């Protein structure tokens, strides 16, 4: 919650790109799940919303973006749907993780990428 860094479109090169080691990006939008291209098929009902980020951060740094208020960021990296966890290692991308997961599976993804 207090470890969350809210970002903007022009403030992406300063916050996440140029950083110390590992930096993640939770591409949320409060419509936890839903797609991009046709904003006609989406879902606000579902309840797998994962706020687990205020917990694994406490266990590196993780950022946080909203594409309804930042439609400039997602199109650059070809994010065709959320939530997509893009891992920024040295101002680049190591691995991506589409379709939400529990705390045991988010550990499985990280621990096969940091050390």
């Amino acid at each position: 919650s207090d470890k969350i860094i809210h970002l903007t479109d022009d403030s992406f090169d300063t916050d996440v790109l140029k950083a110390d080691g590992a930096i993640l990006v939770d591409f949320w939008a409060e419509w936890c799940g839903p797609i991009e291209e046709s904003d006609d098929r989406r879902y606000d009902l579902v309840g797998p919303c994962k706020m687990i980020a205020p917990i694994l951060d406490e266990i590196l740094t993780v950022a946080k973006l909203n594409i309804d208020q930042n439609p400039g960021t997602a199109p650059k990296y070809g994010i065709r749907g959320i939530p997509t966890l893009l891992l920024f290692k040295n101002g680049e991308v190591a691995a991506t993780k589409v379709g939400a997961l529990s705390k045991g599976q988010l550990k499985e993804f990280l621990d096969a990428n940091l050390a």
Partner: antibody, heavy 120, light 108 residues
């Protein structure tokens, strides 16, 4: 409007290969995964694999890793599945299901199926 | 792993039936993402539930998903005559799906 239609009733020899198609329409093809299932009499269902049409990433059942080969064609919206080294065990009605993966995993739209008969 | 279901259950119009979906490894959790496909006569498949409780678009609200004890479940509150179908389930283990034998629901 969403529809999944697969190829017609095939007849193939043992030892050969076969390619089953799955035309997808009424939606953006590259926004949903595409599973494939095997239905034999008295065996229920059997997962073969899935494919993300955005990137062509694949995951398989351990039993069907050497058997199946899932690919896609973005222009024609057609998903694919190539069964190789066909035997009498491969004689089954193969469907293609759609999956919403964003936030959770649920099926929704299935095809009518394609009856494959491996006869010599 | 081996997913298990009831062979066949019986119910009537208006009644509340409950199907189950055991796992051989242990208990069914939120990690398993319990799915529930429906097979009406003449091979008409359609996904009802997935991720333990989240319905698909257009699926009747009576089909609800839960976790009763050590197994996933599918409660049909107010069973219709059209519901007469084979209800398979499907649990995830290490990114691989495992279907069950199916449950022949018969509505009088």
């Amino acid at each position: 409007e969403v529809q999944l239609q697969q190829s017609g009733a095939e007849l193939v020899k043992p030892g050969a290969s076969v390619k089953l198609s799955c035309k997808a329409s009424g939606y953006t093809f590259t926004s949903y995964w595409m599973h494939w299932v095997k239905q034999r009499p008295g065996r229920g269902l059997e997962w073969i694999g899935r494919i993300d049409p955005n990137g062509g990433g694949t995951k398989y059942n351990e039993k069907f890793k050497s058997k199946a080969t899932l690919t896609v064609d973005k222009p024609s919206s057609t998903a694919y599945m190539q069964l190789s080294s066909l035997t009498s065990e491969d004689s089954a009605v193969y469907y293609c299901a759609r999956m919403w993966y964003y936030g959770t995993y649920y099926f929704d739209y299935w095809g009518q199926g394609t009856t494959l008969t491996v006869s010599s | 792993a081996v997913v298990t279901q009831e062979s066949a259950l019986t119910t009537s119009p208006g009644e509340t039936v409950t199907l189950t979906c055991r796992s051989s490894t242990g208990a069914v959790t939120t990690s398993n993402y319990a799915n529930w496909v429906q097979e009406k006569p003449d091979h008409l498949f359609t996904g009802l539930i997935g991720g333990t409780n989240n319905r698909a678009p257009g699926v009747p609200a009576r089909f609800s998903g839960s976790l009763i004890g050590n197994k996933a479940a599918l409660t049909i509150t107010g069973a219709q005559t059209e519901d007469e179908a084979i209800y398979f389930c499907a649990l995830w283990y290490s990114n691989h799906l495992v279907f069950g034998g199916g449950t022949k629901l018969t509505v009088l």
